[model samples]
Target: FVEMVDNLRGKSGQGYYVEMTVGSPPQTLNILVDTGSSNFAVGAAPHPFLHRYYQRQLSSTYRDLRKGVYVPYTQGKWEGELGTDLVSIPHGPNVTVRANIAAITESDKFFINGSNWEGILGLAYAEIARPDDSLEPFFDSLVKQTHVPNLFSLQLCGAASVGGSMIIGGIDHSLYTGSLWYTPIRREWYYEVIIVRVEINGQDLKMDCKEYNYDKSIVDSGTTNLRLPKKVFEAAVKSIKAASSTEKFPDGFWLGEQLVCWQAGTTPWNIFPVISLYLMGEVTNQSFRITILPQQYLRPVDDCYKFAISQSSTGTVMGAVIMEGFYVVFDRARKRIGFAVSACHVHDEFRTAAVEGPFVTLDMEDCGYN
Candidate 1:
């Protein structure tokens, strides 16, 4: 019925957030520009371990949009009711939307880290959402009218510099550089982007693995890490093996330290010969975004296998690190996917986690995940 406004906008410690006018009836909270996940979530309590490792922005003036509310999703599905919330974004103005004040529970994923964060802001295509169940939209809560579906155009890169702008409901021109390559959503919407051959210092490293499956590929915008299988990952560690590095850990995963993501920037893209992925009709990738370790890490592996890159399953987590500097289009309305490589500017809106270049190419001919 009424539209609340938020005028605050700038680079927060991590991504971005705007000013939210929270008051009686209209509840508002400072939300992040999360182009990764699908729901606008926040924390209800304070967490220390989660914030220690990464960036977690906080707002005191913002109100608890869910002041007094409760909602649930179907099965593992999530759906909630919109309480009143008044909020503002710089040029985006106040728009009253059904604010689903997410309760900061312990089991949540994003909550696992950002304890100071209210919850996560879901910005993915909501068509895959249970709309009939709730009124509050992660983004709709801050807009003028819920007339148009919440559609976002993302351009994420890995060039670490204050980073680019993250927009909502509209598309930016500078985000993409070419036409989008969309694979059909046969079983699952996500088409696993795989890195077939990872080379180190010019030598190709071989490893055991399965094709990247969207049945595994997750086209989310909230997650900040890339969850790849252990087989291929172990292959990478083997390639980076040093003479002094001793193979100590079991399963060879988690070498005492490491990080990953989906947004683009100088984050960490695979630095090897090629990183391949299979889209519906197109296969793209190039050599860029390599992982760098402290010389200390390299030395241990020299003597022997330092760490093991084993198969892992946080399937299809295209995090902020890989999505940092590339433009992405989620045309849920049209059932399409588009992406391109380009330089980011002030208004550029997106997220990503850089992996080794050369989008993996697969035989759409194979069809279906095993």
Candidate 2:
């Protein structure tokens, strides 16, 4: 129900937000769609920081939970009290959901006053959920309240447009092409999958079969770019630089930020290699590969292009850039995840799956019916 058509707006590098009317009598608010965390909190008006907030007193169905909670993220943190209210998406045929809500009393200055979001909707598992950490997410609460299935799909477009979509409760067959490749979810904290190896062009990063002693890799719709371990990052950058026919970065050796860049008019794809991530598929028990094309990696900044940054050597985060143009399914009920290319690469797929059929298959035309 929360598809691209429901998007209010999004800032580049900063994640997109879904417009949802929270509280009885409905007050529209922009909620950041985050698959990394498991908490739903809205800003408050009386705060000295950001003024825009959810007026809980306006909702007749609001109930105060009294307990306060703090949610931290890479940009900042949100501290607030717990509450409950009726929430719904004003557009389309979405239903009103009664779920746990957070009324923030205080938050990071940037988080409250700086960013362009009113709240955050965590779409991960319930184990790491905030406030109670045992409560069902807003989407899960929607499933229970609406008797829908425990599935959702995302059709996220690239930086080219402000168009992308989320299919709650099911998959929209038309959004994707080919079969939905299934990969089992290995960890509950995040959608961490067991990666066999990573390859750029034909050369491998050679990380397979080694004891990395980390939490493994995950696909996060909330993250801005793909983050690699220090060793992996260095290897990848060096390999790409070597493979590229173009000279080294004209401006400098490396970007001051975690990212790397190319000359002003030159694209990494023109000389760089194709990045591929091989993973263990749950359905066939075979190695499934997701290719990250040059365009996906060398993102367009103000006028030039920049390669995604490297993170702490111990971590792996597959964020938005790599996920754009793919129709991704988070099959929590089946304990698996699915991915396929979109039909037009721009049009939004408006659909969802039901509990009767935990998975959805594409028709001959690669379209799914709800």
Candidate 3:
């Protein structure tokens, strides 16, 4: 069985959200679809950033688990109470799940200004769930109750597009093109993957594979930029500077603190090079590379542009800027993640992402297992 549900795009491609109903009478809310964490949390208290919140007192079937839940992010944090209630997706799988819900009462920067989402729906494994790992994630409960395929796929249309979609239980062949490239999930938590190397404009970075996976690398839909470890980031930025004709960049541009502006109708896409990430594929001695053109990494902010690649204090994070270029499949049943060219990745008849390879695997040690 398959259920295809549409997703709403957040401001400036910051995030993607899906609609879900919670409680007895079914109070509907727009919940951000985040793959970086595990907790189906929603706003329970009134906040200046909220348009509406879930009122637990109004639900006849609501049962307070009486557990405290706190979630910390790279940019924000939130504390909430754990509870259980009837949850259903109007456009998702045809089943209702008595799932765990973290009712957020207080937060710091979790809900940003002008954002319309009321909560976050974490689609990762339960190992990263707040409070404890024994707590079953919402998707786990949904799959258990319905006995659907243990997999889901995501397609995030670019910022200027109207909407994208989440396919529950199966892949949507129509949403992607060409063949799908599969990569092993090095770890269950955070959908971790192995990075063999990075290339700039077809030129290899020539660094040790360990540097690419320093700490750990993950594909997260919750984050907005393509984040690289500090060392890798510095190397990438240096390569970008050398490849482009423009020698000097604005101060703080590489740090994502300032925006680079051009004339209203002019773009600097031609000056930037295509960035590629080569990942360890499913088979032994095999690898595949996913390439993103300048249009995907250089995001437009109002009349200016913001570099969509940032330095990560932790590990490399392939975020929305990269995800929007492909149709991503989270195949928990197979213990692998798949990527294909997205139908919405085209702009003015130009495809922004290019997937090519099954190249001979690199000779590297256990770089991802650490």
Candidate 4:
């Protein structure tokens, strides 16, 4: 499924995230915020990140429902705990919108509704929520419950644009200050697009090669890395290295600190052409395009590849990396999507340059079942 795909894709660029008010002090976790998949899942128990010290913050109503709670989705299989809490989203400055937050608890009898975060605010595609306009999955819950497609907008800030908001229900028109570029959804459901081509720039040589899978990609704002399958990943690295040597960036680009990156002194400056996953017609940020991992994780480690696909084969497709640095508008009512500039455009690579860490998620972390 992970190979050269002719599909070109496009999107608003940044993904979705849900913001909630926790205990009195309030704990904030920037969740991946997916519209796809059935369960409105967050790291139910983010383990250490949950801060055991805050256990006392639990409201008396907080309870767990980890047992016999089953939700089915098209992606991979997952099981989690659920509970309830006084959760609310910011309606405006100092104002709050309240929903019985579905918190992630281990188990409590068979009550299925004992979940967290005012339950999942479903936003991807069609989904089943509860009477509170709460759907089974976060994304769909909003749409089905509200009798609206649930306008969702994401603002991915650059290193400079830190702390932006992920808008659900509808978008703030002010953010759309830039010209809107529209793209077509590839299918009835699922955020997928086509990858146009991959170009290389370095050592003054430019190669136009449309050899990669753009169709397999699943557009997700939740995912953090550009994951490629094995064969395609290896080929990408080899090609980049070859181009680097030929272009003479013997010391490639310096990604990680303290590492002397050999730069294949190619001229165009774009190691990879401003390639894009064309979603109908919208143009995307070209800088975050990623280089496949040479080794799986650790540098100099055996069998390493930079492609970080979700364990789910669907994720093996274009799950998320392809939509960096762009603001995405899920116009489900119109059944079309839009793209715009995002903070990621300021980065050096087409993807995040940080090194892989044990904390990085394979699927998604801190995702609770709504």
Over the stretch 272-292, how does candidate 2's per-residue lDDT look in tens digits? 576776655654335566666
In model 2, the Cα lDDT at residue 260 comes to 55
* Cand. 2 Cα-lDDT: 0.66
lDDT of 4 by residue, 1-370 (tens): 1111111111222333445454444544333355454344434554433322223244454444433344434543334544443333443123322222334444332122222222234444432332222334444434444443356566544221223445555555554345445544555345544333333331212212222332243455545445544444545445556644534432223222222233342223344323233222432322112222222121210122232222333323443444444556777666656666543333444432221111211211111111
lDDT of 2 at 311: 52
Q: lDDT of model 4 at residue 167?
A: 58
In the range 1-370, model 3's lDDT, one tens digit per residue, is 2346455556666488888999999999989989998899999999988988999999998999988987776788999999999998778877888999999999998887777789999998888888888888988998888887899899888654346888888988988889899988888878899888789988988888888887879999998899888988899988887887574687598778998887876776767888999889888878898988877778887367888998887798999888889999999999999999888884534436877778986574555636
User: Which stretch of 10 consecutive residues in model 1 shows the poorest summed lDDT?
Assistant: 293-302
In model 1, how many backbone clashes occur?
A: 132
* Most TM-score-accurate candidate: 3
- Candidate topping lDDT: 3
- For model 3, how big is the CA root-mean-square deviation? 1.8
Candidate 4: C-alpha RMSD to true structure equals 12.8
Shift in Å, residue 84, candidate 4: 6.4
RMSD each, Å: 9.7, 7.6, 1.8, 12.8
Descending-TM-score candidate ranking: 3, 2, 1, 4
Candidates ranked by lDDT? 3, 2, 1, 4
